[PDB]
Structures are given as C-alpha cells and as structure tokens.
Design a protein around this ligand. Sequence first.
Ligand code: CA
Ligand code: CA
Ligand code: CL
Length: 110
Amino acid sequence: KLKEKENNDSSDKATVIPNFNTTMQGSLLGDDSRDYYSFEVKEEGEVNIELDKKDEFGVTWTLHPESDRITYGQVDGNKVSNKVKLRPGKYYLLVYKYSGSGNYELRVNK
Ligand SMILES: [Ca+2]
Ligand SMILES: [Ca+2]
Ligand SMILES: [Cl-]
C-alpha cells in the first residue's frame, strides 16, 4: 500500500523505498514527469528493478549510485525491468516519462 510522496522531482527530494520486495504506487500524470526514489543496499547482490505500467504510456527509469555508472530500464510492453549486481551503498532511481500519462507500481526485488 506504500505510495510515493510528492514533490519528489529531484534526488534531494527522493521518496525512500524502505525495503526490497516492496511495492510502491505512483503516478506520472500531466506535468508530473519525474518521480525520484532512493534505496540502500546492505549486502552485495543482484537487484531486479521492476516497473509495472497500470496504463499504457511511455515510462522508463534510470538508476545511478549516490557516488558514469548508470543503468536503464528495459521496456517490454507494460513492464520496464532490469537485473543489476549492486554493492552496498545508496542508490537513486529516477522514474520518468517520455510520452503520455499514467499510473505505475515499482519494486526493487532482491
Ligand atoms: Ca508522481
Ligand atoms: Ca514527481
Ligand atoms: Cl540487503
């Protein structure tokens, strides 16, 4: 039932994802085109970031460490996904749209 917290349009205002394997609900309607999130890895491992589109629109995501290591989501229909091996540290996850408007769910699986 966890929801994003606007305004979250910059990493300094990112919505904390408190835990792995936890669904975050958000929306990118109208001129809300960016939702920043953050999370912390405590033990090195593979993380599977999964965005589920609840409406058809053009949305993806970009991951980078708080530390040019950058990872992009891979769009496949109504899922935008990737698997990346991450070391302990804090990470920023920018969910942003490139067309249209809609609702989504986000998980950082581990
Ligand atoms: Ca939003
Ligand atoms: Ca936002
Ligand atoms: Cl962990």
